[PDB]
Design a protein around this ligand. Sequence first.
Ligand SMILES: [Mg+2]
Ligand SMILES: [Mg+2]
Ligand SMILES: [Mg+2]
Ligand SMILES: [Mg+2]
Ligand SMILES: [Mg+2]
Ligand SMILES: [Mg+2]
Ligand SMILES: [Mg+2]
Ligand SMILES: [Mg+2]
Ligand SMILES: [Mg+2]
Ligand SMILES: [Mg+2]
Ligand SMILES: [Mg+2]
Ligand SMILES: [Mg+2]
Ligand SMILES: [Mg+2]
Ligand SMILES: [Mg+2]
Ligand SMILES: [Mg+2]
Ligand SMILES: [Mg+2]
Ligand SMILES: [Mg+2]
Ligand SMILES: [Mg+2]
Ligand SMILES: [Mg+2]
Ligand SMILES: [Mg+2]
Ligand SMILES: [Mg+2]
Ligand SMILES: [Mg+2]
Ligand SMILES: [Mg+2]
Ligand SMILES: [Mg+2]
Ligand SMILES: [Mg+2]
Ligand SMILES: [Mg+2]
Ligand SMILES: [Mg+2]
Ligand SMILES: [Mg+2]
Ligand SMILES: [Mg+2]
Ligand SMILES: [Mg+2]
Ligand SMILES: [Mg+2]
Ligand SMILES: [Mg+2]
Ligand SMILES: [Mg+2]
Ligand SMILES: [Mg+2]
Ligand SMILES: [Mg+2]
Ligand SMILES: [Mg+2]
Ligand SMILES: [Mg+2]
Ligand SMILES: [Mg+2]
Ligand SMILES: [Mg+2]
Ligand SMILES: [Mg+2]
Ligand SMILES: [Mg+2]
Ligand SMILES: [Mg+2]
Ligand SMILES: [Mg+2]
Ligand SMILES: [Mg+2]
Ligand SMILES: [Mg+2]
Ligand SMILES: [Mg+2]
Ligand SMILES: [Mg+2]
Ligand SMILES: [Mg+2]
Ligand SMILES: [Mg+2]
Ligand SMILES: [Mg+2]
Ligand SMILES: [Mg+2]
Ligand SMILES: [Mg+2]
Ligand SMILES: [Mg+2]
Ligand SMILES: [Mg+2]
Ligand SMILES: [Mg+2]
Ligand SMILES: [Mg+2]
Ligand SMILES: [Mg+2]
Ligand SMILES: [Mg+2]
Ligand SMILES: [Mg+2]
Ligand SMILES: [Mg+2]
Ligand SMILES: [Mg+2]
Ligand SMILES: [Mg+2]
Ligand SMILES: [Mg+2]
Ligand SMILES: [Mg+2]
Ligand SMILES: [Mg+2]
Ligand SMILES: [Mg+2]
Ligand SMILES: [Mg+2]
Ligand SMILES: [Mg+2]
Ligand SMILES: [Mg+2]
Ligand SMILES: [Mg+2]
Ligand SMILES: [Mg+2]
Ligand SMILES: [Mg+2]
Ligand SMILES: [Mg+2]
Ligand SMILES: [Mg+2]
Ligand SMILES: [Mg+2]
Ligand SMILES: [Mg+2]
Ligand SMILES: [Mg+2]
Ligand SMILES: [Mg+2]
Ligand SMILES: [Mg+2]
Ligand SMILES: [Mg+2]
Ligand SMILES: [Mg+2]
Ligand SMILES: [Mg+2]
Ligand SMILES: [Mg+2]
Ligand SMILES: [Mg+2]
Lengths: 23, 136, 59, 79, 192
Amino acid sequence: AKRGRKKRDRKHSKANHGKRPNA
Amino acid sequence: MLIPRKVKHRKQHHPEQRGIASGGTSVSFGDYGIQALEHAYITNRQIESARIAINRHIKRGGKVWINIFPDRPLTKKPAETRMGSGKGSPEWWVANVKPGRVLFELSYPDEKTARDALTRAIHKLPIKARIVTREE
Amino acid sequence: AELKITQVRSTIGARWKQRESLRTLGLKKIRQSVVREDNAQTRGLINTVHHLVEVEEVG
Amino acid sequence: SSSRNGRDSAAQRLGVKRFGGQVVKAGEILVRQRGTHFHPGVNVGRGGDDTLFALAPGAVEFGAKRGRKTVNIVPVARP
Amino acid sequence: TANIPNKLTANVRTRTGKGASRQARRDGKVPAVLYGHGTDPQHLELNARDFAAVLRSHGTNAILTLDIEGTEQLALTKALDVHPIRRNIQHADLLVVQRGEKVTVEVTVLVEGDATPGTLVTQDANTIEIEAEALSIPEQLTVSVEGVEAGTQITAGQISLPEGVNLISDPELLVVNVVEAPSAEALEEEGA
RNA sequence: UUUCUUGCCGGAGGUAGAGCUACUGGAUGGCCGAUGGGCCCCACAGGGUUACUGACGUCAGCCAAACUCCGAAUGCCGGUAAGUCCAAGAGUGCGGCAGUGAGACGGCGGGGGAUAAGCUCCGUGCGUCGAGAGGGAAACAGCCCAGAUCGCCGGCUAAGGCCCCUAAGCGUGUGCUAAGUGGAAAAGGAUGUGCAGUCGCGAAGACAACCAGGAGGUUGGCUUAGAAGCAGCCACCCUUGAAAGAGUGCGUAAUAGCUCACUGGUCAAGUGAUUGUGCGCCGAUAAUGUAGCGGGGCUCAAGCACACCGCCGAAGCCGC
RNA sequence: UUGCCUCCUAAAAUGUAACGGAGGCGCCCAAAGGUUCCCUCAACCUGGACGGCAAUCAGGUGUUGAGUGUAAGUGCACAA
RNA sequence: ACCUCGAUGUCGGCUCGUCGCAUCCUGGGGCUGGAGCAGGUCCCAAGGGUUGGGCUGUUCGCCCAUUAAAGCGGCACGCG
RNA sequence: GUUACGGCGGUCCAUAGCGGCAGGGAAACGCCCGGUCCCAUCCCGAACCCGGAAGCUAAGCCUGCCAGCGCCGAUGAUACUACCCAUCCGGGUGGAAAAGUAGGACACCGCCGAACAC
Ligand SMILES: [Mg+2]
Ligand SMILES: [Mg+2]
Ligand SMILES: [Mg+2]
Ligand SMILES: [Mg+2]
Ligand SMILES: [Mg+2]
Ligand SMILES: [Mg+2]
Ligand SMILES: [Mg+2]
Ligand SMILES: [Mg+2]
Ligand SMILES: [Mg+2]
Ligand SMILES: [Mg+2]
Ligand SMILES: [Mg+2]
Ligand SMILES: [Mg+2]
Ligand SMILES: [Mg+2]
Ligand SMILES: [Mg+2]
Ligand SMILES: [Mg+2]
Ligand SMILES: [Mg+2]
Ligand SMILES: [Mg+2]
Ligand SMILES: [Mg+2]
Ligand SMILES: [Mg+2]
Ligand SMILES: [Mg+2]
Ligand SMILES: [Mg+2]
Ligand SMILES: [Mg+2]
Ligand SMILES: [Mg+2]
Ligand SMILES: [Mg+2]
Ligand SMILES: [Mg+2]
Ligand SMILES: [Mg+2]
Ligand SMILES: [Mg+2]
Ligand SMILES: [Mg+2]
Ligand SMILES: [Mg+2]
Ligand SMILES: [Mg+2]
Ligand SMILES: [Mg+2]
Ligand SMILES: [Mg+2]
Ligand SMILES: [Mg+2]
Ligand SMILES: [Mg+2]
Ligand SMILES: [Mg+2]
Ligand SMILES: [Mg+2]
Ligand SMILES: [Mg+2]
Ligand SMILES: [Mg+2]
Ligand SMILES: [Mg+2]
Ligand SMILES: [Mg+2]
Ligand SMILES: [Mg+2]
Ligand SMILES: [Mg+2]
Ligand SMILES: [Mg+2]
Ligand SMILES: [Mg+2]
Ligand SMILES: [Mg+2]
Ligand SMILES: [Mg+2]
Ligand SMILES: [Mg+2]
Ligand SMILES: [Mg+2]
Ligand SMILES: [Mg+2]
Ligand SMILES: [Mg+2]
Ligand SMILES: [Mg+2]
Ligand SMILES: [Mg+2]
Ligand SMILES: [Mg+2]
Ligand SMILES: [Mg+2]
Ligand SMILES: [Mg+2]
Ligand SMILES: [Mg+2]
Ligand SMILES: [Mg+2]
Ligand SMILES: [Mg+2]
Ligand SMILES: [Mg+2]
Ligand SMILES: [Mg+2]
Ligand SMILES: [Mg+2]
Ligand SMILES: [Mg+2]
Ligand SMILES: [Mg+2]
Ligand SMILES: [Mg+2]
Ligand SMILES: [Mg+2]
Ligand SMILES: [Mg+2]
Ligand SMILES: [Mg+2]
Ligand SMILES: [Mg+2]
Ligand SMILES: [Mg+2]
Ligand SMILES: [Mg+2]
Ligand SMILES: [Mg+2]
Ligand SMILES: [Mg+2]
Ligand SMILES: [Mg+2]
Ligand SMILES: [Mg+2]
Ligand SMILES: [Mg+2]
Ligand SMILES: [Mg+2]
Ligand SMILES: [Mg+2]
Ligand SMILES: [Mg+2]
Ligand SMILES: [Mg+2]
Ligand SMILES: [Mg+2]
Ligand SMILES: [Mg+2]
Ligand SMILES: [Mg+2]
Ligand SMILES: [Mg+2]
Ligand SMILES: [Mg+2]
């Protein structure tokens, strides 16, 4: 589940503000 | 195991698991207690294991109060089945626990043995708890 | 006493009472400002859109 | 594998239809309900299915009369 | 047995609210209210550290001498709103009191001494209500256990109550019950 | 102007929360004590004794989508005063011409599911995509900023950024981190480190290291071969007293011995224990190739927190 | 499973989906319809041959816990 | 039920490999209820090696004779 | 106008209730006496209905005082919440409970009639 975790966590960047499409 | 003799409705929604425990946050029956710190579903499996753990550790004489009751049923639809065809049949029982609620309470003469039995119980629970004393 | 209201944010992503409060204040674009009296109607009208504007009194 | 339920009836759109201080015609029905949750007040009549209606033109206003929520029609002055 | 009042400082809360209380609580201060027959609910910030220190030294029930902007008042702790988790005191209630004034209060009861070994002593009511003067309030009173006979109950009516204090609870409220220590074949038989 | 917004005024609710000795159910531990249980004297009368089970009641702590003595914020209905008003290009009515009726993800409230799915089904004067160009997120419909009339070899900014790639800071001040943490993760383990708060003793010399000991009643009574203090029960006794524990660990299978908790010493100031935290450590673990900062590189920070000072930056705003 | 009715979901106006959670309906009553007047239950204690907690009698306490043709909900003791 | 139904060929065997290490053998160790011989368990270690048959369509599996050993897996359950 | 009065009402119908203690009988309000007559009991002149004034404050009624039970109930805090910040944590500005505490309350207001100086 590395791909899912690592895609899902890049929403927590400063430029995304804790949100991103498809979580 | 702790099972209610009957519930008016046997298929409820999942208990809302938010907020801080408002009722039941003090140690009143015994002198030492285990007091919760995280939201969870404490099933009767966890409660039975923790109670037996405390009884095994103290093993002589002392009162264990399980002041939480598992009376809320979580259902589970049978395996290998697709979605639909209605809600499943209830097959485990739960107490809804908020951060703040004293779960188990103990009365025993000495200090260290009581603390150790309480932490032995804590290890059987799906949450972080702490040992709290009868005084502020 | 009376105020000057300057719009700093925009109305993209803004809910509808916020955009309408901005329109009722008479200002349309960013960095546009209006000057108006300091009664309770204006105070509420800018309370709605405080995150979109910045105000300062005159004097 | 089947649900033994899944039936419901139509919503009957019950509730208060005219609120306080609202001018009505004589005959307008003001609150649809089952029992008598609102009891008929002054110059307000009650229908067969416990529907409260106005027996005179005026303004709706609610009240409590001996522990009973009541609905009344108040005669507004003629201009 | 007069208890010396404890001297705190307090100052009138400028503005009220949850934001103001949170800020004051953040600066190491406790929001509190004076009331009583002083007929003026007066909103007072006081030092959190000193409040906790005096509550440690003299329990929940202790007279204070409040210095409100120079005016000097006698107060008594009525209630404390405390967080269930962080355990910090959030709010305090202060009846205004003066000398020669009876007041109803709740005093903790701590069992003292060792019991007979074959059985365990267990308290059901840890607090007993008493009527007593403002200065003469006991912060705690003891109940005797010294080798009791077989299991018996104890109620508030047979306690060595202090002088100048009066029981309020009905005398037949149980406080400490000696119950026989569960045997090996009796302790794990209850709970399921 | 009937639309919409904001202030005020008139309303009806039963949600969040809470409470339950206010109902319906669940449900913890006490207390008294029935009726029904057994027994005696002796009848199956009657009386009392007894683990009785222990109605009811009562004390204290609780729980609920289909519980409610209670109970908001918002929203909704109306009125009213204004606002916007060379515009919202707003309402409403009649008509001509439609397309649409497969939606998606994200925020908040929920059902189904295992409180799984980039799952599925609803609510939302919620948003964006659809039907949206431009800037940021390395790349990246739906996230953040901002809505493209055209031109300009002008300026100011937003999100994000300022060692080099790469425009602008190897910025200043005070601290923290040693893990390349920053630049993934759980239960749980842990003398990492900084700060704050109490507690025990402590130049009448305490913690460590160093020596003399650690006894007489007396191998306490339990089934067994010895429980003697070191399988497993009953718990915490006197004399010398300082120092002796119904004796702390090894091991003698039982003893003994090695020792210890505990007083005497020369030594010379700290010493031990929690609680709240700021950062870190371990747990840690897949298959083409570093490969869980975009790269180089970075602790001599280019990392983190708090203040402050500038600047860069869009098709946004201004200038012509 | 397909029409109708009631409740919860349903987020305090209305409305709101799922092979979500629970039940009813396809009748009945010439009075169980109209009006006029009159009354207050259930439960509990005490006293009574059958007769036992329990059946009918008497005294008291009893504001709603009874009942309302029929599900559920809203009502109703001013009484429905 | 997200791409593919105006076509992404579906098991086993053969040929040929390639990578991980969660080590089967060989190599280095700590603890043992390790005397030695031989083991048990954990840790480190991926360089090379890792057999031929009977039964069955077989994978799986059962067995036969060996061997230092006859490892487990990913690659469109690798490879038409 | 005075009233230890009698009626008819009202109040987001208990701050008014329950209970307890102590009083009153002018007219009134009652009880009380009887069933000849209207009228009545699913039997009962108990009720209702009709006639009367021997006795009464024992009740009902009303008056005064008690906070024991029931009721009402802040201020402050907290829960929850709208909107907005905010990389999960969390925070700010407005609204703000339930429970609990301080306390309140043994109702108040109105219109007619009765007796009384009038
Ligand atoms: Mg996984
Ligand atoms: Mg999502
Ligand atoms: Mg909810
Ligand atoms: Mg609690
Ligand atoms: Mg609660
Ligand atoms: Mg645990
Ligand atoms: Mg319905
Ligand atoms: Mg009708
Ligand atoms: Mg009809
Ligand atoms: Mg308006
Ligand atoms: Mg209003
Ligand atoms: Mg209301
Ligand atoms: Mg409801
Ligand atoms: Mg709730
Ligand atoms: Mg129930
Ligand atoms: Mg509810
Ligand atoms: Mg306008
Ligand atoms: Mg326009
Ligand atoms: Mg238009
Ligand atoms: Mg269609
Ligand atoms: Mg469709
Ligand atoms: Mg849709
Ligand atoms: Mg989808
Ligand atoms: Mg959701
Ligand atoms: Mg669902
Ligand atoms: Mg989806
Ligand atoms: Mg949505
Ligand atoms: Mg399309
Ligand atoms: Mg775009
Ligand atoms: Mg769009
Ligand atoms: Mg935003
Ligand atoms: Mg610039
Ligand atoms: Mg910026
Ligand atoms: Mg480049
Ligand atoms: Mg540069
Ligand atoms: Mg910088
Ligand atoms: Mg530098
Ligand atoms: Mg720098
Ligand atoms: Mg520095
Ligand atoms: Mg690390
Ligand atoms: Mg890293
Ligand atoms: Mg971690
Ligand atoms: Mg640890
Ligand atoms: Mg640290
Ligand atoms: Mg032994
Ligand atoms: Mg020994
Ligand atoms: Mg020694
Ligand atoms: Mg870098
Ligand atoms: Mg530009
Ligand atoms: Mg432009
Ligand atoms: Mg609704
Ligand atoms: Mg709603
Ligand atoms: Mg719908
Ligand atoms: Mg059916
Ligand atoms: Mg009828
Ligand atoms: Mg009839
Ligand atoms: Mg009766
Ligand atoms: Mg789909
Ligand atoms: Mg495609
Ligand atoms: Mg195809
Ligand atoms: Mg093709
Ligand atoms: Mg092809
Ligand atoms: Mg093709
Ligand atoms: Mg290959
Ligand atoms: Mg390895
Ligand atoms: Mg290997
Ligand atoms: Mg080896
Ligand atoms: Mg080895
Ligand atoms: Mg090599
Ligand atoms: Mg064959
Ligand atoms: Mg392979
Ligand atoms: Mg294949
Ligand atoms: Mg393969
Ligand atoms: Mg092939
Ligand atoms: Mg072929
Ligand atoms: Mg009352
Ligand atoms: Mg008289
Ligand atoms: Mg008569
Ligand atoms: Mg009298
Ligand atoms: Mg009377
Ligand atoms: Mg009340
Ligand atoms: Mg308040
Ligand atoms: Mg964060
Ligand atoms: Mg309250």
